[PDB]
């Protein structure tokens, strides 16, 4: 769970692959349960280049691409805890108060 989806609920492949060296983490309402009768109304997704100092994230009901840009982590993947990514839950987050910013 928590990784890039490989197939949509309609049985068609998610038909998208990441770049050569970027980590991606993806979260939705009902996880990986491809029960063919559920509806994932929201998503939260984040990406970071393994050698990059920036993690980028976006959610379903928001525009813009929101970053953090901490110089500290430079050889981590988004799977690591100390990246402050948007994990399971807080999937909509139509507003941001004081953590991440792009405006």
């Amino acid at each position: 769970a928590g990784k890039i989806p490989t197939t949509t609920m309609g049985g068609k492949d998610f038909t998208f692959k990441p770049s050569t060296n970027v980590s991606v983490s993806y979260f939705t309402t009902n996880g990986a349960t491809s029960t063919a009768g559920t509806v994932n109304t929201d998503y939260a997704v984040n990406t970071k280049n393994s050698s990059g100092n920036r993690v980028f994230t976006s959610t379903n009901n928001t525009s813009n691409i929101w970053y953090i840009e901490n110089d500290a982590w430079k050889g981590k993947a988004v799977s690591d805890s100390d990246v402050t990514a948007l994990g399971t839950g807080d999937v909509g987050k139509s507003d941001f108060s004081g953590t991440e910013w792009k405006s």
């Binding site: 379903n60 525009s63 691409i65």
Partner: protein
């Protein structure tokens, strides 16, 4: 030159955030307008059936 590859990077970052809008309401309105039209059509069907049999059709 390195400076060219410093502006390519500076434009890729700009064109990767163009305030992409959420297309959620703009489709639920379509769904709603389909259901409402369907109901207004079903009313015609019901009221013609009554004018046939002096009774609205039995359920199921």
């Amino acid at each position: 030159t390195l400076i060219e590859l410093l502006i390519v990077v500076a434009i890729i970052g700009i064109l990767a955030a163009i305030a992409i809008p959420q297309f959620s309401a703009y489709r639920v309105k379509a769904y709603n307008s389909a259901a409402s039209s369907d109901l207004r059509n079903l009313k015609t069907a019901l009221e013609s059936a009554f004018a046939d049999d002096q009774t609205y059709p039995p359920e199921s």
